[PDB]
Amino acid sequence: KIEEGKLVIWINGDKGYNGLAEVGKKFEKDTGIKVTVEHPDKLEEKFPQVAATGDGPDIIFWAHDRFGGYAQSGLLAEITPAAAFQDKLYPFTWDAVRYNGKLIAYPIAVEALSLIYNKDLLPNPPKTWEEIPALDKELKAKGKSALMFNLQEPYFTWPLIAADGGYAFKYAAGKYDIKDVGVDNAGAKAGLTFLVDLIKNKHMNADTDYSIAEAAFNKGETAMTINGPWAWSNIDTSAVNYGVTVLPTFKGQPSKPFVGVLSAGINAASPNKELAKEFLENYLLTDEGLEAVNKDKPLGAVALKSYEEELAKDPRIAATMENAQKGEIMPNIPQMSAFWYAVRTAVINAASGRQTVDAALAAAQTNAAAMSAGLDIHFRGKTKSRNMKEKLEDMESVLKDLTEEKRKDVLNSLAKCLGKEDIRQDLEQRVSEVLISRELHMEDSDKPLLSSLFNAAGVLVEARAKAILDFLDALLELSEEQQFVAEALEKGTLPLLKDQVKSVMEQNWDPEARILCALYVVVSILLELAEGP
Ligand SMILES: OC[C@H]1O[C@H](O[C@H]2[C@H](O)[C@@H](O)[C@@H](O)O[C@@H]2CO)[C@H](O)[C@@H](O)[C@@H]1O
Ligand code: NA
């Protein structure tokens, strides 16, 4: 239960939350309404977890790319600003927050990654990625690194991966093709390979994360970093004489950052919706409110035209917008979280050597395709008494009691059902007949699974049959995600898929919910069979 007569606001810890709390203060002074601003960790995951139960903040700040998924899960109030208010913001910002024709958040600012360089160490920064190793080699001799940036978050490495041809979902003539994913093409492989080569040749470290990179640049130990506008404040506090510029090219093509619009959404369960709209339209999105935030940590190019004409004088904003033009605004579609989780794991696995480049990107492509199809609730037709957690837990313990041979025999039959409604329906008829009759018939003798339902005394174990019927009911819920589950089984990458399916489930373990639950069941069962308990 969110508390009436109060505003609670979540925003990321790298953003200007103290600035925002200043606006919160002004609001209370004018209206007597208390505003509390918080910066929880993992906010983008935590929000949909608490909001799914009707709890959480009244207001949520994140880049626009998450909001479509929140909207599809019913977690956000529809935003309806008057036309007089809308015309004050850049129209491309409203686009970023428009989902299936409705506005699902207020746009705040545009953020793009830039190349940030130390002027004293590197008066003329490199224009190509290809120069960097030689440059690092020379700087290392003098006790400095050429480039350090967060390799843990794919937001940071995606610009190199996209440069020669990687993409998330194909975008043609104003429409995204969620069935055409660009994660394992030649261009993405070339970029990720360049990155992994930098690591292997000791120009960067696989474990470099946000705070390490920040500290190194700000303490003058590295000539370059890659970061957003929010980072400029800490650099201002430090000794460093820095510039902000276009990212280096790769194979003669520009680095293509995914560009975010920081946005503010209103919790669908909030009992203070009118107060939130009032705080956002009349306090935050004003010259004065944006200035308070921007002076704590810079926002980038703000959505409010009146204040952005001031900020556009800064050449750091020009560089931000130069990179923004070379990159692409992210989609706000639910499938974005799928893309992100897949790419995140791939880059980390490739960087650390846990997977090769080709293998990391082939698995990511498979997972993103599977999860994208699951999140696409549209155009589906299904024709021609226990907790879902409870059922999976039951099913898994039954299969755990099997011998290993019997597990593989179950798996042989189930893998044949994937993508084949005829085979699935037939196995369902047979398992069900065996369950009633307690006997195997002649047409059962070539189905390994069906003998697997019997113990070494030749007697049927009813719970094995029921577990299988439960799996085949779940598999029916799935449409085209089935073929990607097969690929993952064939390539040995089900554990990545299971992990990614869990991360995508907004809630802790709704049409979106039914399908992903089913997908999690199917993947979990296949993994237990393929790799053991
Ligand atoms: O790394 C994947 C991640 O990218 C973006 O997250 C950014 C965010 O947009 C910035 O505002 C800032 O907080 O840095 C984050 C990277 O750590 C996407 O917005 C997010 O959905 C995605 O998971
Ligand atoms: Na562009």
From Swiss-Prot:
| Effect on the protein upon substituting L516D | Does not relieve autoinhibition
Q: Which residues form a coiled coil?
A: 385-410
The signal peptide here is: none
- Disulphide bonds in the chain: none
- Can you name this protein? Gasdermin-B, C-terminal
Q: Which part of the complete sequence is present?
A: 223 to 411 of 416
